[PDB]
């Protein structure tokens, strides 16, 4: 009873290998309309459809030195249907520059009862038609975010198991409709836990994820994994080097992600624009063996410098676009181990709770 | 960290006892719009809002001999917001007759990739806000239907796990918002399987349901279960008496349903209006100890005569009403052990696939 | 692929219903040779084969007013093969008085690595032949003890799951060889935890047990469950009435043990001889509905008064035997709700760690 | 609470690299006494302690051309405590030739009730004290064999769960006592199944093994895996090239074995001495990225010529020895990609059931 034919299988592998092609990464430009409110209000701008339109249009129409740095662009619903100033739909803008377009399909998180503050994610209702439509309209991959937090009795048995189960459902549905699932099991940096405790939980959680994807029969070569880096909690007093968290990210994934996964696209997680680039470099330089692409899927850590330089004023466009382009060139050096560098609001920490 | 307070728990427990208080049953007026169309071209009536309002009004305004036999009625979402000719809203029409109002909250089945024709159910997205409102609007319990088929390589381990889980998510969200969940893991009659096969599969399903409802921290005294009876398959050559169906069914449950469950309300299946009331009676006369209510949540098997009397014509209203009443009274004595059979609509098999 | 024929099934049900027949309980006289060392040294006696022989012979040859109080006697290996003074093998002594004989088959506990102090149990190697032999030699049921402790991260996911898995293996093997498994998932009273925390863990652990027994295909009507009472930890400062722990024991089991289980034979757990009898009475008087026998399988709480009165001196035999008989009559009133009573070393607490 | 210290972890990791260091393999001299009898009436020799000591001595004293091709040898327990004619103990005979000494620690398969002919394995009882001593006596790794069969309703979900678990218990106990565990989830060739079927089942087994080894907190850099190659079933009508077996086998592993596993040492199956070395070579020439050692743990398929030369007669010693050497050298170049085939004992299928 094949889940997929040969030709669907090779077309998902094809898309997946494009997105993470050597030296390419992803721009996560998929902020909910309510989440992009607090980004905009941090630079004084009002949250109107055309302020979001112009901001998203800022990122997509940047110089062609970004073209080989950005293999894919995850958008939010409203944005997939928005047009540029030259009248081209935003997905054609991205494809014209050699970027594959994706689409966030999760409908936010929801509380699991019986737990200390834990969530599952929702969005599976009608997800099959939506993917069918988003595929007609230009999308080729998808993002579903699950959220886990390290606390004293968290992440619990039930939490890890329901979040792993709905990631796999999501990925099964995505792949029947020709769309590559980005799987996002996120562990947040909230808390005071040390490096090794993030390591032990990352492992425990990816183990449960790849078992869930096996149970649901999903083609691992046409998926991507979007995991946290492995980092001390944001209240940790101990301090850890870039090498030590490289080792600990890379061994956790060695220990748990089968080589069949096409690529691994890290979240930035709240790290500064620059410590994100620096860590991604420490990781691709690790001497250990790493049979999958280790690259980036960054929201805040490609966009903070560009937002502060945009300011709300169309006059600042070319100023802000080159804060975005310097970040994409920087990260495309780090996803190949070639990043050697001093930056100011590229050093601001981007952690929220 | 507890899902529910002691007040929240007495409410749920009291609601679930009112429904299956001795001699009472559940009338499943649940049919979606498209599934009730198939019932209405049965008798040459077009499928209009008004015909659907009229036929429902005929079951909920049947005379007061039926008040002691109907603890609850499950309405599709549309019916909940329609009014009798009196102007009285249908929730308040049945409140008046000593019955609790349920709501169907699932949203149909969807296929599971990699599987031989199997399904999970969808409907969790926005469930909690939906239930909060149904509760304000008169509903005190919910129905959600998962469907398994016996067959070559079915019901799969993946389909059992995914269905028990999604019934557990549904149930936790119902109790948070005050609503007793009904838990319907229906195993279809379709196929040539024998009684004992269907006993195996039922036993292994309900075990997996109650491990899932335990993992999700579900309050069992405020639940009900609506399973199938254990029956030979509808195409099975060999023949089985009604006391063989009573044993096979009482024992499937005594090996799986914890005593704390407040009530078991059986589903009719493809069973004739009369076979369903004889197998229900044979079960309550089964002398093996049974520490839950054994009662009925029949839809087709309480309405077949009703429907082939009415025929779509206003004049047959009291003739239809009476045939639904005669069934409700037969089933309310089946629900006590006290039914001795002594028409043709009522011996017709009501099977479909 | 039946696990058992009809005739094996009815012979296990027959044995199980004997052991817990109305007003009957079990004597747990199965102390390891190393465990019975610390019992003997507490009364000054040397641990020699004939001091154990004479002590076990004290309990088995007691007055015939014990005959209707004691449905079964769990022995240790060496003891199954030991003879009385009249030359009769100990199992014939027990059968002559109407007691079924059992046999502890677990080979002690072992540490699970990676956990904070947790154990699994071993004993499955060659268990199938041993049961075959013990059945030829008089044994008809068996005891396997698993041990869980409540602490901060205990009992963990892995611990509950391996102990539930090897209980079920044990029970599968026992039943192929015609022997009724007593399943002993013990939660110890060590720690300072309140009543509700023992309740929540008992539930979590029996849920996992009955799922494990379902997965392994074992006939629940020819088994017994030997669970702790549900009690505050032994360092709890809060205080709780006999009724409150009756409620909490009886609801935990209602919520999780299917009625098919023939009987529930509690461990005493360290409680005093008398608080054990008192609590077992509070439980059989609980107004809730309880579809399985609630009776006793006591080691320390039928034998402390008899050991202190035996003292090591054969002269004290008839003195010590009537400390054992008064305890068996007392508990056979409590397993029927008829125990109304002041005792001294029958009030000593028997808790070890 | 960690299973292992950093010293305990480097030791294990170093041991596992010595065994599968490039070009080396494992000789399975493991056969129990009863299973080697079947091999020795093959060539008309009676099964004596001395013949068994003599035949083993012939493989472990083969000349020094084989030192670079044999990183480890797995002895049955008896062989570990026998001496060559020199007086030198067999563990120290192979220490001398640059090979690590393994020990078989399992204790045979046992049936699983309720199942269609399926097995778990036993041998955990007393395992830890056994391993502590094997370690003193020269063993640095262990073998434990679980067996699954493809067929009607096989390998069952119960048999997969129970076998992965018991291999995880075995592995945790080996690493506590210093011994690298080898993890052999063998899927038998028996049956008419096609290559792709056997790929499905292998994929779903090794996924369940590595969720179990993760749950049990198993150190993966100090493990090896000894699985079957993915092969059509021995009775399959249709025919498959060796590059179809190489793809089907490299991809089954890339979808399941985490990169951290130090080595994969294949089992021969019923494969001819020569087919086994061609499929091993086709696999190391498979250009798909493979981040583990792909090498051999052959028993029958490194000794068939050896055995039909020797014939039971002292005079053929150096003729036998040479045929085992010619195989070890073929297999050590298969283990690098560098074997081009260019007798009859060596094309005979070595299948059994």
Curated annotation (Swiss-Prot), chains A, C:
- Any stretches that span the bilayer, and where are they? none
Residues binding beta-D-fructose 1,6-bisphosphate are 39, 268-270, 297, 300
- Assign the protein's first listed, main location to one coarse class: cytoplasm
Kindly state which keywords UniProt assigns to this record, in alphabetical order. Acetylation, Cytoplasm, Disease variant, Glycogen storage disease, Glycolysis, Hereditary hemolytic anemia, Hydroxylation, Isopeptide bond, Lyase, Phosphoprotein, Schiff base, Ubl conjugation
Where would you find this protein in the cell? Cytoplasm, Myofibril, Sarcomere, I band; Cytoplasm, Myofibril, Sarcomere, M line
Modification N6-acetyllysine occurs at = 38, 104, 107, 326
What intrachain disulfides are recorded?
none
InterPro entries, sorted: Aldolase_I_AS (IPR029768), Aldolase_TIM (IPR013785), FBA_I (IPR000741)
Q: How is this protein annotated for GO cellular component?
A: actin cytoskeleton; cytosol; extracellular exosome; extracellular region; extracellular space; ficolin-1-rich granule lumen; I band; M band
- Organism superkingdom: Eukaryota
Asked if the Swiss-Prot or TrEMBL record annotates the protein with the keyword Lyase, the reply is yes
Cross-link named Glycyl lysine isopeptide (Lys-Gly) (interchain with G-Cter in SUMO1), sites = 38
First-tier enzyme category under EC: lyase
Q: Which residues form the active site?
A: 184 (proton acceptor), 226 (schiff-base intermediate with dihydroxyacetone-p)
Pathway terms, separated by semicolons: Carbohydrate degradation; glycolysis; D-glyceraldehyde 3-phosphate and glycerone phosphate from D-glucose: step 4/4
The answer to keyword Lyase applying to this record is: yes
Regarding protein family, the annotation reads: Belongs to the class I fructose-bisphosphate aldolase family.
PANTHER family from the UniProt entry:
FRUCTOSE-BISPHOSPHATE ALDOLASE
Disorder named in the UniProt entry = Glycogen storage disease 12: A metabolic disorder associated with increased hepatic glycogen and hemolytic anemia. It may lead to myopathy with exercise intolerance and rhabdomyolysis.
This one is known as Fructose-bisphosphate aldolase A
Native organism: Homo sapiens (Human)
Q: Which gene name does the record give?
A: ALDOA
């Amino acid at each position: 009873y094949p889940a997929l034919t040969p030709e669907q299988k090779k077309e998902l592998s094809d898309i997946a290998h494009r997105i993470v092609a050597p030296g390419k990464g992803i721009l996560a430009a998929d902020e909910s309309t309510g989440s992009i409110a607090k980004r905009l209000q941090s630079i004084g701008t009002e949250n109107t459809e055309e302020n979001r339109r112009f901001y998203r249009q800022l990122l997509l129409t940047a110089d062609d030195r970004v073209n080989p740095c950005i293999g894919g662009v995850i958008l939010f619903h409203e944005t997939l249907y928005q047009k540029a100033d030259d009248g081209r739909p935003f997905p054609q803008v991205s494809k014209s520059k050699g970027g594959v377009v994706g689409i966030k399909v999760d409908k936010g998180v929801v509380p699991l009862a019986g737990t200390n503050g834990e969530t599952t994610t929702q969005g599976l209702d009608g997800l099959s038609e939506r993917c069918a439509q988003y595929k007609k309209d230009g999308a080729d991959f998808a993002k579903w975010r699950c959220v886990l937090k390290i606390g004293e009795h968290t992440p619990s048995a039930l939490a890890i198991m329901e979040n792993a189960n709905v990631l796999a459902r999501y990925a099964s549905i995505c792949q029947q409709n020709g769309i590559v699932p980005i799987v996002e099991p996120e562990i947040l940096p909230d808390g005071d836990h040390d490096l090794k405790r993030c390591q032990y939980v990352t492992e425990k959680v990816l183990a449960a994820v790849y078992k869930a994807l096996s149970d649901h029969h999903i083609y691992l070569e046409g998926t991507l994994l979007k995991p946290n880096m492995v980092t001390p909690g944001h209240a940790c007093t101990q301090k850890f080097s870039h090498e030590e968290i490289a080792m600990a990210t890379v061994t956790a994934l060695r220990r748990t992600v089968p080589p069949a996964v096409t690529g691994i696209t890290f979240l930035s997680g709240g790290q500064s624009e620059e410590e994100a680039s620096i860590n991604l470099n420490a990781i691709n330089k690790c001497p250990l063996l790493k049979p999958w692409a280790l690259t980036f899927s960054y929201g805040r850590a490609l966009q903070a410098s560009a937002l502060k330089a945009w300011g709300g004023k169309k006059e600042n466009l070319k100023a802000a676009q080159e804060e975005y382009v310097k970040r994409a060139l920087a990260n495309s050096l780090a996803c190949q181990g070639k990043y050697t560098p001093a930056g100011a609001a590229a050093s601001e920490s981007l952690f929220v709770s």
